[PDB]
């Protein structure tokens, strides 16, 4: 029977420094015991001086960037180019998680 | 008969300048910005002297930062508030942060041209455009205080100063005089007490009319009668000066 | 597109009158004459075959119509409109009664049927009253033999006897002369007979004339045999033939 | 004679015309007036924000579609948010299923097409904006009107608002000079000001009374208000 | 289906079917409340175009939406029902999820958005009522008085009336109350009540009746005698001078 | 399950509810009262799942009360029960169904007798002198069948009741810590605060 | 009050204007057609006119092909007369499909005559200015014809004719038929009676036609076909060789 | 009585409806364009009236394409001419996807057709203000068509609608008498552009832009495509030589 | 669009009144006339058919007079057709009712729900109301005999006599003149017959032309009885009162 997930690997780091935040990852990306591809990236710079990275089914962790992504984009849109800050960025993406609760 | 989203030969929607026609004659209201916060007032004009003057509210918050004036008929108000209110609830809880004075402004004109008996461009279920203006006041921290005049057009403008309503005319035409960046919110709340004054057709006391301010600090508060009072006790004075 | 037509095309006038109603009646007046004669053990329905030319096959017309194998109808005004309730009328046969308990429906009960059907488009939105008044003639096992009529506000009465159409009036008047509560069907289809020749203008005989009874069971139109109960219709519409025979007698 | 046939959108009078689309271009005439011009490496949109009193804003007349496009509007503000949003979409759409960037040409057609419906269906009312719309695509810079009639048209330049005409002129008579003007920003913008006051009468183009836009090669399409346009003024 | 905006603007900016919604009102038999230190009360007047009716089953023109708080109004009788139907089934509504009966604003609040809402929906036209009404909030004997139109404004008064008439009423109201001393009881408040009413009722012991409400859904009408005392200890007051 | 209880005696119905409210390892609760009044002269118990437990009975209460203030008249306790009953068997062959057992306990004015009406999820009805829901019937119907009178005063009954809870302390795996008792007879419903040991 | 004649709602006389106006409609092309019955065939004729020369003559016409039995010919608008056909092809196969057989000629007839009489009773649908004349030969009634009006009418003929000059043609028919006693043409090939129908066509309109003025549809057993330019040619020599 | 216009679906008492005859008006005020069909294929060209120095020349195209075989052709609202190619695009992609075969010009025609006169049976809706000129070619030949407002339309050698179109049908009437054999995809394409020169005197007040394409089983394979470049220009030039 | 055609059935005049329920009263007051008195024992329904012949089958008819419940039934006056539909949504209500609390719907109860219904064709819908007015004689435990009347509006009342349809005016006044609370069944029938008798438009009031029904007590039971007369029992309770 057809199962909707799969695992594409890979592990992410984030630490933040007193005026600095890194997000690291490996650029490896697999299936079962076949490697993919050696170098897909998997952590982005969404705009807004905003990195996030959504690891583990692959196909899943794009939607997600690219709909925060786009989310990002229409904040701007409706209110005047306003930056969106991080604890902002948070609680939107809580929604954007949430809302495939099921 | 004829649409009631129909277009007039000159290009204008009848049904919205009639609506127009509507709030001119309703009750003033007045709305003045200063660095140190906006000042809304509007005049109760309560109809029979049985009738509890305090239970007339045309001074109505949207949110903590977020207040709003209205003048024409407003019942039709009373689902603007709604929407208002919610929308920035609902972005507060999306974002957790403050909505803007100006997006939410926008958000209440998007549901004015929602009108019609069937216009193909979406569901605009509502048989006639909004009969009353607001004057939506406010601060955020990207743009400090704002005033903000909505519409039935659903059009929304910007103002240093605004009055609608039976005395608009006269009462703008006072404002503009009056009107320069360094007022304070004292003197704004005398001037706004001063041009009520002279357009409403009763003498204005704590009772027929109603102050109320937003602040960074405290937010939007409405003037409790007491307090207006001595504001209106102070200017008696300082016009008697000279 | 889409019916945007949702408010009523008939409405009540300063008057009270319902004009479409009216009109409808109108519509019914300017038809060709149609009638009904109930006897003791049977009831007969009748009415003129006025065909629109020569070259017009007036069998593949019927104006009198078999709704249930004890029910038939016949009428006086828009042609078009009748067909359509006749369709209507046998389906409601079946829908709301034959498959709910099995039997065919008693002839008041689809007269109250049809009469429902006609009275909607007397205030559904859209649409104009159907411009035709009915003559249902039909048998039903606890009721005997009925004969109603149903018009196009959507009311009906029951009738020993009556017209409708053109020249209703006037054979309603000598119907009123010769029944009685002891007519035998024969009898009856004789009055009818009568009553129609002063109606119809020409050639008045078995192929100008459309005559059809509700009377004993004719088993030899059932269509099959081996269950006792089934006896079969005691609706059967007359032959041409049928119809010269009894005219000799006229 | 047209009384009786201006009732509504879907009914063509004797003579072939559709009065209440008519009339929505009427609301464009009384509108304020734009400016739009390109050369082969940008293109500028120019506007006068109008004003109710001198204690109002200047209601804002450029609105900014996606990186890549943009546009100016005359008449009614509500019609030009929904047309906008809708020109955002389309282009958002564009992006997000082929990663492609929305052409002008096609964003034209888009317009055109959703403004047609309004004028062909009992119920609805036309648009009563005129739209101005510039953008670089794969093939350059670009330049669109839009008229709430449907009609859509690529030209090198153009204005729409009141008194618009004087601008229109101005510019058909600098065609072959501002055309020309690739690899400066700075001096379509100026050709576009010029083409703009070629329309004032009442005042003068002032610092929060003067809009402009630019989009173009590596530039993406941004706006400039208030003090930013000084050195325009 | 149908849609049509009925209620739309005209050229100087009024929704005449509003406006002839009110004019249904001013038709209707008259109706008032006042309240008092302790209580409010509302008055009604009985047509009398046709005498022969059962009272006893003949709906009454005052209604309780809960158990503390009432509802008369002038205008449609069957537009009345629809309204006291909704107002009653949200005060159930209300008690089930706030666990709390609705307070006297809320509930007028409430009927006030249902009239609102009529007058800018397609296909419907708008109440041709007006309401009075009246209670006393949950755990508070500060007593209530709320009007609604057909424009679906509402607002508190001392004493109101609406109805045929309520002009006349109104007057004898705006110079025979003192908001400083509020008829301290509930007899000098049914008083005040019904002379108001016989300014316009002329003299009908059988059509004017009386509810009284209390704080703690305390309520209960007046039967004709007990009424028909207050018109005679009335009329006297007249005479003896 | 939590023990639901009914006696019809002589002029009145005694309704005894455990007041146990046990989820999984822990009794959250013991005063609990699985009770809503639905008329002055109408209380209904129940007993089941977790949260349609409560939501049934207050959806039924709030149904009750606006019937009484339309029409200003309460409804007997047979027609009360029959509109629980139909509102059951609604439920049951819905998306997900009301898994709730009920007691309907009522003084009918107009007749002037008591009314017990026993009704479980399905919307099976019976009127019954004695009724109980759960495992408790197993227990207490013997236990009535043995010592139950018609005649009986409400004491009597209230002692019957006594002497079920005493058979349900005894033989019971769950401790559903005591019971409330509520009586409803020609002048409403009340509440024995007295039974913690009577 | 004045826009009973713009629905279809009754006029104080118990009229409807819109379907006598879509009546109108039915002649606005100025052609004739007629259809007689043969033995075992039924033949329809339809004046051809082609006024542009600039149209391409083959698309010209208004004989359709409902179905492998059903012939229909249209008397009005060609647009309406597509829309009459459209849905007519459609109804004749969703018949088979659903019933296991052919849809019968006068059946087909009676569901558009349905469909039109409620255009008369429904006022958001216009009556189709147009009238169907629908021919075969039905495998129980043998050689039929049966057409409908914007009234929703419709009934069976022995032979007809409509359009402008329709009572010509009509008269023509009925006296040929008082003479010959019988309700067809005893014609054992259909070439012969799409003689005898062009040939009164001609009687009757007083009109001559060349290969290129006619249009004619022919049904027998299991099949309905239009002829060609050129077997009407031959069918206007033979017609040519006894006057 | 009157008002018989004002509505759309509504016959007037000499059986017309006014609403589709204004809705014509409304065609003849437009542009002109024509079309013209050739031994195996054929030609479509249109008048684009030049309104100023502005336009970007080349840019606003009129002629569409559907699928990849059909070219369209209107004069008259051409906001509602994209509708009615919007549609007939669908109408295409949809009889392609059930019968895998590319839609057939009359089987395109007749869906135009339809769409059209089903504008014309409610008052809920506008006809179309244009008339429509299109074709291609398909399994058996090529085809050309021209639908009016009113949903008609026929098989044609020649086509033209709009201002011109006398001018356009005068010359369209010589050429099919002096080539009864047919005239050639090559040929068509010049008389094409000589057709609209002439045609723009009725409006020899501005000044104008052609426009052709074509579709010919041999010189495009039967897909439809437009004149660009030489010989565009060699096309407006023997039209530039015969207008003197 | 439709908008021209719509009548706006649910509309204010500037008066405050609802057009199209003034105009069916209108239509109500040449309907035969209905009358239905309440006695201490009792409740007496009678109406006078419109129009007759001396065919029609007074046997299998009824115009008039219908059957709710088993302890309600209503008298017509108005389009039958209209009455028929509201009496069937009536007789179902009254069973949901019964199947719901498994109690016979108390009679005011029914009679508001039926008057709701006409309530709503009054504010929205855009349809026409119904053209009846009804008078409710029905029994119940709760106020024992109750006679209701109901109108196009929606509005419905409680009455000791009372009558609906043609000479309304004229026939209250002669109930107004000799009705006593006291009365009994048999006084009320007679009451009855002799309004009937001097309001009718008729020469004189024959049994072919009415239509009797009474809901009584019978004290020889315990229970309610609706008796609707039969022609020969209104031909002699026609004579004994004295109009032969």
Not at chain 1, 62 to 82: E, I, Q
Not at chain 2, 1 to 14: H, I
Not at chain 6, 120 to 140: I, M, N, Q, R
Not at chain 9, 190 to 196: F, G, M, P, R
Request: aromatic share 8%.
């Amino acid at each position: 029977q057809f199962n909707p997930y799969g695992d594409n690997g890979g592990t992410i780091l984030g630490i933040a420094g007193e005026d600095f935040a890194v997000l690291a990852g490996d650029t490896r990306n697999i299936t079962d015991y076949s490697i993919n591809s050696r170098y897909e990236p998997k952590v982005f710079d969404c705009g807004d001086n905003i990195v996030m990275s959504a690891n583990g089914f692959a196909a899943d962790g794009d939607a997600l960037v690219k709909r925060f992504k786009n989310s990002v984009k229409w904040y701007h849109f409706d209110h005047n180019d306003k930056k969106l800050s991080i604890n902002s960025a948070a609680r939107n993406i809580q929604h954007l998680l949430y809302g495939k609760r099921f | 008969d004829r649409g009631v989203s129909t277009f007039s030969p000159e290009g204008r929607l009848f049904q919205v300048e009639y609506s127009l026609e509507a709030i001119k004659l309703g009750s003033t209201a007045i709305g003045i910005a200063t660095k140190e916060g906006v000042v809304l007032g509007v005049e109760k004009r309560a109809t029979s002297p049985l009738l509890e003057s305090d239970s007339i509210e045309k001074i109505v918050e949207i949110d903590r930062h977020i207040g709003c004036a209205m003048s024409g008929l407003t019942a039709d108000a009373r689902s603007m508030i709604e929407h208002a209110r919610t929308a920035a609830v609902t972005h507060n809880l999306y974002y957790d942060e403050d909505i803007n004075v100006e997006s939410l402004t926008q958000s209440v004109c998007d549901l004015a041209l929602r009108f019609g008996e069937g216009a193909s461009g979406e569901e605009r279920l509502m048989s006639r455009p909004f009969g009353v203006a607001l004057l939506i006041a406010g601060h955020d921290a990207d743009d400090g205080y704002q005033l903000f005049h909505a519409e039935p057009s659903g059009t929304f403008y910007r103002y240093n100063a605004k009055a609608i309503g039976s005395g608009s005319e006269g009462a703008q035409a006072e404002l503009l005089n009056e009107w320069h960046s360094s007022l304070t919110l004292k003197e704004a709340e005398l001037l706004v007490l001063k041009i009520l004054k002279q357009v409403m057709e009763e003498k204005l006391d704590e009772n027929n009319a109603q102050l109320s301010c937003i602040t960074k600090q405290d937010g939007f508060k409405i003037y409790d009668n007491e307090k207006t009072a001595e504001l209106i006790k102070e200017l008696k004075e300082k016009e008697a000066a000279e | 597109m889409t019916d945007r037509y949702s408010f009523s095309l008939t409405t009540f006038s300063p008057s009270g009158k319902l004009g479409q109603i009216d009109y409808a009646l109108t519509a019914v007046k300017q038809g060709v004459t149609s009638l009904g004669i109930k006897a003791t053990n049977g009831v007969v329905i009748a009415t003129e075959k006025k065909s629109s030319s020569p070259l017009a096959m007036s069998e593949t017309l019927s104006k009198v119509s078999l709704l249930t194998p004890d029910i038939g109808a016949v009428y006086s005004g828009m042609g078009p409109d009748y067909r359509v309730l006749v369709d209507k009328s046998r389906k409601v046969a079946h829908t709301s009664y034959k498959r709910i308990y099995g039997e065919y429906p008693p002839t008041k009960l689809l007269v109250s049927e049809v009469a429902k059907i006609m009275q909607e488009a007397t205030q559904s939105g859209g649409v104009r009253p159907f411009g035709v008044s009915l003559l249902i003639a039909g048998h039903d096992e606890f009721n005997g033999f009925s004969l109603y009529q149903v018009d196009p506000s959507g009311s009906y009465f029951p009738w020993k006897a009556t017209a409708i159409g053109k020249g209703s009036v006037a054979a309603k008047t000598f119907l009123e002369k010769r029944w009685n509560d002891e007519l035998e069907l024969e009898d009856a289809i004789h009055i009818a007979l009568l009553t129609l020749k002063e109606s119809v203008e020409g050639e008045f005989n078995g192929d100008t004339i459309e005559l059809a009874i509700i009377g004993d069971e004719n088993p030899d139109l059932l269509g099959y045999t081996g269950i006792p109960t089934d006896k079969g219709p005691r609706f059967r519409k007359l032959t041409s033939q049928e119809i010269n025979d009894r005219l000799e007698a006229l | 004679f047209r009384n009786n046939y201006d009732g509504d959108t879907v009914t063509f009078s004797p003579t072939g015309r559709l009065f209440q689309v008519e009339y929505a271009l009427e609301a464009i005439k009384q509108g304020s007036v734009t400016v739009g011009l390109r050369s082969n490496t940008h293109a500028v949109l120019v506007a006068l924000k109008r004003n109710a009193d001198e204690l109002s804003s200047y209601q804002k007349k450029i609105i900014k579609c996606d990186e890549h496009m943009g546009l100016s509007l005359a008449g009614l503000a509500p019609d030009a948010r929904v047309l906008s949003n809708y020109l955002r979409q389309q282009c958002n759409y564009s992006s997000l299923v082929f990663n492609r960037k929305l052409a002008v040409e096609r964003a034209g057609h888009l317009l055109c097409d959703k403004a047609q419906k309004n004028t062909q269906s009992y119920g609805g009312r036309p648009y009563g904006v005129g739209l101005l719309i510039i953008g670089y695509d794969k093939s350059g810079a670009h330049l669109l009107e839009f008229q709430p009639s449907g009609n859509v048209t690529e030209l090198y330049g153009t204005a729409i608002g009141a008194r618009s005409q004087g601008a229109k002129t101005y510019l058909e008579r600098t065609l072959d000079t501002f055309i020309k003007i690739d690899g400066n920003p700075d001096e379509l913008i100026k050709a576009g000001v010029e083409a703009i006051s070629q329309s004032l009468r009442d005042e003068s183009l002032t610092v929060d009374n003067l809009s402009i836009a630019i989009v173009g090669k590596d530039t993406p399409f941004t706006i400039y208000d208030g003090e930013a346009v000084a050195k325009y003024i | 289906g149908y849609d049509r905006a009925l209620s739309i603007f005209s050229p100087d900016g009024h929704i005449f079917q509003v406006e002839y919604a009110l004019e249904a009102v001013k038709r209707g038999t008259c109706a008032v409340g006042v309240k008092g230190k302790n209580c409010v009360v509302l008055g009604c007047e009985r047509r009398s175009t046709l005498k022969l009716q059962d009272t006893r089953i003949t709906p009454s023109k005052v209604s309780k939406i809960d158990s503390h708080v009432v509802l008369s109004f002038s205008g449609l009788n069957a537009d009345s029902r629809i309204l006291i139907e909704k107002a009653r089934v949200e005060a159930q509504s209300h008690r089930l999820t706030l666990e709390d009966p609705v307070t006297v604003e809320y509930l007028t609040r409430y009927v006030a958005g249902v009239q609102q809402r009529y007058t800018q929906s397609g296909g419907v036209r708008p109440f041709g009522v007006s309401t009075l009404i009246a209670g006393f909030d949950p755990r508070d004997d500060e007593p209530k008085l709320y009007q609604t139109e057909p424009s679906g404004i509402y607002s508190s008064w001392s004493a109101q009336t609406i109805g045929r008439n309520s002009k006349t009423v109104r007057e004898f109201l705006e110079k025979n109350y003192d908001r400083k001393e509020p008829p301290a009881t509930v007899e000098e408040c049914v008083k005040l009540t019904v002379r108001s009413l016989l300014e316009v009722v002329q003299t009908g012991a059988k059509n004017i009746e009386i509810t009284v409400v209390k704080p703690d859904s305390d309520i209960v009408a007046l039967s004709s005698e007990e009424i028909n005392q207050y018109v005679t200890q009335i009329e006297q007051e007249k005479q003896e001078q | 399950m939590d023990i639901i209880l009914g006696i019809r005696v002589q002029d009145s119905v005694i309704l005894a509810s455990s007041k146990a409210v046990t989820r999984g390892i822990s009794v959250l609760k013991d005063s609990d009262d699985k009770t809503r009044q639905l008329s002055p002269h109408t209380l209904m118990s129940f007993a089941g799942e977790a949260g349609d437990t409560v939501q049934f009975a207050e959806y039924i209460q709030a149904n009750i009360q606006l019937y009484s203030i339309r029409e200003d008249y309460e409804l007997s306790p047979q027609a009360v029960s029959s509109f629980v009953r139909q509102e059951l068997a609604k439920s049951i062959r819905s998306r997900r169904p009301y898994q709730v057992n009920v007691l309907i306990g009522g003084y009918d004015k107009k007749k002037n007798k008591p009314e017990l009406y026993q009704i479980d999820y399905l919307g099976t009805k019976v009127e019954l002198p004695y009724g109980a829901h759960g495992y408790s019937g197993f227990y207490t119907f013997s236990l009535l069948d043995h010592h139950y009178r018609p005649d009986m005063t409400t004491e009597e009954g209230l002692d019957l009741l006594k002497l079920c809870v005493q058979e349900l302390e005894k033989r019971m795996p769950m401790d559903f810590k005591g019971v409330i008792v509520k009586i409803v007879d020609k002048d409403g419903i009340r509440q024995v605060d007295d039974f913690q040991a009577q | 009050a004045g826009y009973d004649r713009h629905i279809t709602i009754f006029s104080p006389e118990g009229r409807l204007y819109q379907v006598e106006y879509a009546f109108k409609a039915t002649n606005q092309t100025n052609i004739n057609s007629l259809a007689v019955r043969g033995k075992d065939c039924t033949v329809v004729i339809s004046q051809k006119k082609v006024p542009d020369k600039l149209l391409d003559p083959t698309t010209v016409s208004y004989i359709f092909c409902i179905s492998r039995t059903i012939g229909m010919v249209v008397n009005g608008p060609i647009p309406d007369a597509r829309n009459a056909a459209l849905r007519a092809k459609a109804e004749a196969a969703e018949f088979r499909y659903k019933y296991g057989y052919d849809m019968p000629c006068d059946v087909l007839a009676k569901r558009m005559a349905n469909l039109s009489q409620i255009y008369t009773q429904r006022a958001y649908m216009r009556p189709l200015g147009v009238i169907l004349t629908f021919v075969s030969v039905d495998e129980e009634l043998g050689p039929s014809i049966y057409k409908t009006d914007p009234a929703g009418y419709y009934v069976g003929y022995k032979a007809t004719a409509t359009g402008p000059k329709q009572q010509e043609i009509t008269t023509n028919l009925e006296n040929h038929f008082k003479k010959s006693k019988i309700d067809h043409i005893n014609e054992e090939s259909w070439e012969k009676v799409v003689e005898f129908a062009i040939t009164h066509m001609i009687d009757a309109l007083g009109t001559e036609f060349s290969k290129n003025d006619l249009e004619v549809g022919v049904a027998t057993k299991d099949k309905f076909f239009t002829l060609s330019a050129e077997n009407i040619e031959e069918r206007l020599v033979a017609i040519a060789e006894q006057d | 009585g009157t008002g018989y216009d004002l509505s759309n679906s509504v016959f007037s008492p000499d059986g017309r409806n006014f609403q589709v005859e204004y809705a014509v008006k409304a065609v003849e005020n437009g542009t002109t364009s024509i079309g013209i069909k050739c031994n195996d294929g054929v030609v479509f060209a249109v008048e684009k009236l030049i309104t100023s120095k502005l336009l970007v020349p080349q840019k606003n195209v009129k002629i569409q394409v559907v699928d990849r075989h059909i070219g369209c052709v209107y004069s008259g609202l051409i906001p509602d001419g994209r509708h009615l190619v919007n549609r007939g695009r669908e109408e295409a992609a949809s009889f392609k996807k059930l019968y895998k075969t590319p839609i057939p010009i009359p089987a395109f025609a007749d869906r135009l057709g339809q769409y059209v006169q089903a504008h014309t049976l409610y008052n809920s809706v506008r006809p179309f203000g244009v008339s429509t000129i299109f074709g291609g070619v398909d399994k058996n030949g090529a085809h050309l068509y021209m639908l009016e407002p009113s949903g008609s339309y026929w098989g044609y050698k020649g086509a033209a609608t709009g201002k011109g179109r006398q001018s356009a049908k005068a010359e369209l009437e010589k050429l099919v008498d002096h080539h009864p054999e047919g005239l050639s995809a090559r040929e068509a394409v010049k008389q094409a552009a000589k057709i609209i020169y002439l045609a723009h005197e009725d409006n020899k007040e501005k000044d104008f832009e052609l426009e052709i394409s074509w579709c010919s089983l041999s010189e495009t394979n039967g897909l439809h495509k437009f004149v660009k470049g030489d010989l565009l220009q060699e096309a407006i030039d023997f039209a530039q030589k015969e207008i003197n | 669009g439709s908008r021209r055609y719509d009548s706006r059935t649910t509309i204010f005049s500037p008066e405050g009144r609802l057009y199209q329920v003034e105009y069916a009263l209108e239509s109500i007051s040449h309907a035969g006339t209905a009358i239905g008195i309440m006695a201490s024992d009792g409740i007496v329904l009678a109406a006078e058919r419109k129009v007759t012949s001396t065919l029609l089958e007074q046997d299998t008819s009824t115009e008039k007079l219908y059957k709710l419940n088993d302890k309600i039934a209503v008298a017509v006056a108005g389009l039958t057709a209209d009455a028929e539909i509201l009496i069937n949504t009536a007789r179902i209500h009254a069973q949901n009712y019964l199947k719901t609390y498994n109690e016979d719907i108390p009679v005011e109860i029914l009679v508001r729900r039926l008057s709701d219904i006409k309530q709503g064709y009054t504010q929205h819908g855009g349809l026409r109301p119904f053209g009846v007015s009804f008078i409710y004689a029905g029994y119940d435990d709760r106020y024992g005999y109750q006679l209701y009347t109901s109108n196009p509006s929606g509005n419905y009342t409680g009455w000791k006599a009372i009558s609906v349809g043609a000479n309304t005016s004229a026939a209250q006044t002669l109930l107004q003149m000799d009705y006593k609370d006291d009365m009994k069944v048999d006084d009320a029938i007679e009451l009855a017959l002799k309004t009937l008798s001097k309001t009718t438009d008729s020469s004189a009031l024959t049994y072919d032309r009415l239509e009797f029904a009474t809901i009584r007590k019978g004290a020889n039971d315990g229970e309610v009885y609706q008796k609707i007369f039969k022609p020969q029992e209104i031909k002699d309770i026609l004579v004994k009162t004295g109009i032969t």
